[PDB]
Amino acid sequence: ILIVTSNQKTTISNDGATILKLLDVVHPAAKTLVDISRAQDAEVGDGTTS
Amino acid sequence: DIRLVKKVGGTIDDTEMIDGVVLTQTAIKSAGGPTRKEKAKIGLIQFQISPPKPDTENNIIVNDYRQMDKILKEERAYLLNICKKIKKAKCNVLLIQKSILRDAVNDLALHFLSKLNIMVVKDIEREEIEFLSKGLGCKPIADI
Amino acid sequence: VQIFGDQVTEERAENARLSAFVGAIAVGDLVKSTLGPKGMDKLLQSASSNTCMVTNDGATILKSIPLDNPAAKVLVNISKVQDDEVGDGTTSVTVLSAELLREAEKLIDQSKIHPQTIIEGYRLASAAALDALTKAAVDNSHDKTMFREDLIHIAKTTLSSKILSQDKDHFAELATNAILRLKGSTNLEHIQIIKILGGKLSDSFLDEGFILAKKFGNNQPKRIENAKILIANTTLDTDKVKIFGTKFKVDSTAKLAQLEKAEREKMKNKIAKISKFGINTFINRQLIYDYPEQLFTDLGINSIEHADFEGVERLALVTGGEVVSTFDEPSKCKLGECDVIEEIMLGEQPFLKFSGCKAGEACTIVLRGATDQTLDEAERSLHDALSVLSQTTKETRTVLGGGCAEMVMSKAVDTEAQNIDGKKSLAVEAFARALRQLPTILADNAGFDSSELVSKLRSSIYNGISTSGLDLNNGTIADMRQLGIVESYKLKRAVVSSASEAAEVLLRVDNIIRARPR
Amino acid sequence: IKKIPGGAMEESLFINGVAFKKTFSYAGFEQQPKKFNNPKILSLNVELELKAEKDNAEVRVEHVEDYQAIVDAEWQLIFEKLRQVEETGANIVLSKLPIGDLATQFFADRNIFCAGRVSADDMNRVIQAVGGSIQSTTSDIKPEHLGTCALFEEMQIGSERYNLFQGCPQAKTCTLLLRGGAEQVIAEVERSLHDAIMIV
């Protein structure tokens, strides 16, 4: 997934975490997926997408 | 070498010849000084009569109280003895140039110059110093 | 897929070469009128403060005018380098480099020649061109009188293009004397050109000395004799010691009266050390205040204040002395000498006249003219004239001009075109035909024929006369040695190399990329 | 692991130590040798340059004869600070704070390499690699606290200089240089390794 934020910073990633982050999610219920990705990424670091 | 003095007021007929040099500046009169002096010798003061404050920074420190008293006394004397030496040469008129970084003639010094009947004129332009020395034949004075 | 951003002009087609070629033609045609002795001066209208500028040199014109074309920058930059390198021949590089691209245009369009073939012919054509100047030059170093005559004719050639075409007979003697004065110092900064408006144009002169822009301060005399000059770059005025952390712990003002007196005593002691030399004139670059100025009166020494650091170099060399500081040791130090010093007045501003100095390693030129615009033109002139003559000392070899330099190159270039059989011969012939246009525009500016007059110069050289050239006052062929016009080898080497390499720039383009302005 | 824009990912190699960017060009950097057979590492924290000593600057001087001595004292103590580093035989000098031109030229004469402008996270990785300790005072330096390795060699990597340490008998550090074409290639190789290193 190729994402470019407002500051024109190019990034290419397949990780739940990076992708979700490079995305400022304002919806409240959708940020639960952001939390478990960072929680899975902080401890284990693999299978975030899963 | 020709001088033209601009002035508002008067009429065209009032223009006339002056045999000697004329000063565009005016007297301070702040102190009560003379403004006319018959048979007066004009001296060109090219320095500043002011409290001591030399080129390098000068930080004055007062350690005891007699000293506050003294600093004042000594100054009322640094201006007096320099004015006393003007009486020794019997110079009757002084002309000071534009002073930079400090006042040209201190108000405390005007009391000594006004009581001894000396006309004081300050704020003269620097380029005119060559004019006054060439006309009056008076060499400038940069030090006592 | 537009990969570029918004407002990005790109040209990747034939319009790119057309836009780059038409830009040089516009720059080329702009300077065709400024070439030659009959050329017309140009007028510049500045956009800020209405500050006009009249100048004939192409370098000042092209740098002043705004041009957004990238091809125009190359013609601007090659003219700036030629103005800084030699100081003359900038318009020749601009018109020749544009004509090489003009002649190369029809090869690309009509004959359909590769760009790599056109430059490849210019390499071999430029090599044979410089080889013609190797044999066509003449070394006049063996005799100083002939070299003295060579600087005359070079001054006749350079000054004829500017507005001083009539007064070049008088300034030719003025120009060559300044070069013989410098005796080989090719630095142009050692000549002070004092600008004075008013009077006839021929009223210029070259006094044997250094003319100051300022006067004496208060009472020092104007006329003196047998004065010893001493130069200093010394503060010499209210000496602020090298460490600024200095202070005075004053317990009473009576002691501070002694400290300010001590500052006057050391200054009185310093001026007392100046008197040990036994001088009559003292010069310092910093502006002198009142207290040290007064002590020179009793000693009988003159004082001059606020001299510029670039003038101290000229002042030291005309006087022949040395700049002295730390005056405790007068034995090792050196000072100059002069016969007479006198203050003069040229217009409103007074000046100090020096005459009879021992050393003559520098000089000053006083110009006189109707307008500041004419005075400026004049100034720019002697600078271009003295710049060529200054480099003539280090490069003694010279080349005859007047259309003979461009044609003797074409004689050798056309000879080499036959031994390179193929398609490259058209490129070398294009380089030859580009050189024929320099005497053509020189004839067009004077209002003569472009074809018949050049045809007579063509036939005259191949018959076996390598001294024929154009004469513009009568409009016929004449001998160059009798007329007396000649250029330096470094000039003709520079314009041929600059115009050749300038053509190599805008022939390899195949795309013009323009980003956004900032 | 750090970023190196430029190169191909296949030319990477395994490193038994650290490789950190100097981030500053010193006046006497080229004079030092790049190859030491038996280098010795010593980590510093004191600032080796002529400046204020301890967060203040105020010096009163009455006599001008002592004004020459107080300046020579500052020149005396700064070489006394550097001579204590020289006497122990520390070939590599490292400090978080900057190192001035006066110190690096003193080390440059007698074949002593030095570097600075490094972060605290990089400094903590240097100690565990060489097995030394941090010493923020030159007087308490002893020979036993100096780290050692096999060899030293500064190599050109992507138009950037890196000080390589390798060949230690017991190294706690693994730090590989990630070279790649685009800045996302080196980033993807980092995140892929950072995810795999957590699993193993």
Place this chain on the structure above:
Amino acid sequence: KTSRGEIIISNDGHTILKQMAILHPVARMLVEVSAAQDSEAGDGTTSV
């Protein structure tokens, strides 16, 4: 009447041409000729 608040009467051609701000540069050259006539001779600044 100049740009600032100063007002001046002038019969001298040099001071007339000096205070007049001319847009054309060739006509502006006459300001320098009157300055040259004023500096050299000092009389007949309008006759030139």
Place this chain on the structure above:
Amino acid sequence: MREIIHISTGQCGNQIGAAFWETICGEHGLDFNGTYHGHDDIQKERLNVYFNEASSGKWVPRSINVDLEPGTIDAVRNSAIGNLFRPDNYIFGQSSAGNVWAKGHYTEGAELVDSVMDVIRREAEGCDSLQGFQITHSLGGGTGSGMGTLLISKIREEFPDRMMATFSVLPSPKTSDTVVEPYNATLSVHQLVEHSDETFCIDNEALYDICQRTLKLNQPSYGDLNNLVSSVMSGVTTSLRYPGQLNSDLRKLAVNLVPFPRLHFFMVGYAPLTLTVPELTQQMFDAKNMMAAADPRNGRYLTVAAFFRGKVSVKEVEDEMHKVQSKNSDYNNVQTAVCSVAPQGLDMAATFIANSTSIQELFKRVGDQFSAMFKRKAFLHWYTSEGMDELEFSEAESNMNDLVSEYQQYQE
């Protein structure tokens, strides 16, 4: 010491204080809910200067906002930045000073001041290191001027030593429509000088010029003005909340910038009003960047003190000072204070605060209006009615003769 209270009084006071807190909170890092999302020690290790750590880290600023017009306080509170300030802190009471020093001051000091002394006491008891108080008032209004005078006095009594810094906003002659502005601004200084320890002069008229010249906003809104005032305040306070030693802590500032006691008034100077230290040098000392109407070139600097920020070394600034002193000698004075953090938004700024004889112009003016335009005893009955007499006004004009004299005495 560790902490300083920040009183804000008046409609101008509350606006400038709200802007100041909006700047400060974001500077060293706190969402308007009080939570600290900042990185890291540098922004947290001097947060105790102006915030009270509560259990649970709901930092809350130590500020006492007061006004006699419920409305201004209310607006600020209902707005954003309404969770930080504790609800009990606000002290606001009807009716309105009515834009009169005399009336507003006496009447509500009689009431609002008592309540304020009460709040200033217990909330502060809460600290272990009072260092002084920062008041933001408007010199020319009603509530702010009158109350400020009363409070300054009252506090000084209950806290002898404690330093006392003010940021009064001087009136704009042109843009201050109310006619009785000078006649209040005069009575305020009468007491500001006798009590305060360091004060900063900000003129709305000057703020308009900088807003329209540099920023180029077509019409200044009080908001713009407030933002600029906020920036200078932030620089002076960083001089305080960032670990540093150059002018470390308020009292030091005072000692360094006050030659003699009866001269509190400072001319702020701030740039890069919308970079290299040499570039910012000219901007600080440009005569147009002063937020004081009086020209400083005609005047005379007495003690300069420049507060840089962002990436700057010791020598960048020292070399700059050496170069500058050399050319403006006629105008050895210098005091540098480099910081490490950077302006929110910009990399590097440089605040400038120099004592200058030129303030005497801004006081000769105000005295001229006060006397000449009230030799006719105009609009005076409004003040005599409240209870205060005219002898007090004579005392007030007399003490400005004095101020002017002083500046003249230190030979301009």
Place this chain on the structure above:
Amino acid sequence: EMGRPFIIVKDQGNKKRQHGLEAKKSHILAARSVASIIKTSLGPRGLDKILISPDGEITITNDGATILSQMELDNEIAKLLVQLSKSQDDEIGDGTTGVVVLASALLDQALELIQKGIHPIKIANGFDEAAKLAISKLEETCDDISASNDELFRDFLLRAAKTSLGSKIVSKDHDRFAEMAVEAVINVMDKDRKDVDFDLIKMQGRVGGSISDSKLINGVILDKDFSHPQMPKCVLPKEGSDGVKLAILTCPFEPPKPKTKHKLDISSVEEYQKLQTYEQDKFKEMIDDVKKAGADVVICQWGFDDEANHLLLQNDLPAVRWVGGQELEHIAISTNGRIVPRFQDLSKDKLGTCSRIYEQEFGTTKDRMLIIEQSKETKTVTCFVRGSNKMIVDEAERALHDSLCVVRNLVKDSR
């Protein structure tokens, strides 16, 4: 939607997306748009391109990295090609154009295979196996040159030097630039012919002259004149001596002052006269220290004083001012000297050695640029490149830089 504002990411309406086959066609055509720029530039018959920066300055270049670096783009696919050319430029310094055309060639051929329905990972794995297979074959077929002597090894650099210069600027004097490029490495090289230091040779261009005027000089280029130019410009060595005895100093000529702010208090006139004596004796002691050291030319970092310049002219001692610290790094390695911090540590062993010091004009008024030359082989070579235009000499810098980088690759054995 169900009527409510269905928003997920901040700035929902601003950003877009692209998927499916249309996302691929945007990628391949974006590479073809960049490939058409590079395709007409590659090879010896190429054509430079002219670029225009936002500040008005232009650069006439034909190296894919400098073109793509100064190109304002919006598509991210070309921005990765901008970094790929920069990657080839930084490390190897050869083939920027190739890496670009070649990557587009793989992308253009991949477009036809995406139409057939092959998964992209099988496409990517195919090129990875094919790339290593081609590298494994080409490593076997190429021959080694280390068996030859040094006389023939110089010719192999001339083979690659003429290859790198061509296709670029200065094709006219490329035979001499090849000899000049090879002569630069003969001076700066290791005895084992391995791991030569590239940082010892810096690039320096000069706007003026012609290409034929360029020549080799072993020394430093300073853009400044001597102090107080009354002395002769070209100083010569003594009759019998090891050299000119170059001296370098990172201390300005002044009285010694503390680095911290100080307050020297003078409470008496007698102490004030001793300050005058202390002021003069320091300058007297300073010039006596460099006199006894035997130095002829002195290099000062932080500049000096009017009073010592005269003291420098009488003793026949040229000097300079405002020499940056980066140049002193270049002066010490060239002349093999040690930079002394102060005068107390001044000794004759730390002074450098070089052949002669002289200065020329290059024209009328441009600037006085200093020149230094060595009498033997040293560890420093400074290319003295001239040019008729600023764009010519600017392109000649990066062209000669790529030439030295190609020779730097051949320093590695058996490549």
Place this chain on the structure above:
Amino acid sequence: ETKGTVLLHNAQEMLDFSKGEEKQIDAMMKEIADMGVECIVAGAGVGELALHYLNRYGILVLKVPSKFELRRLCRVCGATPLPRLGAPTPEELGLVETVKTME
């Protein structure tokens, strides 16, 4: 608290002012350690020179830059803080067996 600034009249004070510090800090720190302490909880920023002598004897340093974060820790070990830099009293020293650092 009031204008802490160095003052060095002669070179004899310049030489001893730099090492004086080492010695003094070292003394206070040694004093702290003869009591057998191996971890000290700091209330604000700690200097680098004081840190060099703490980790010499293996004394752990802990940051608690707030009032309530420092008070809650004293209730665990039951220690009585004193702001002086002298010797902790033996009755006031707390008891903690282990201090682990894990992920």
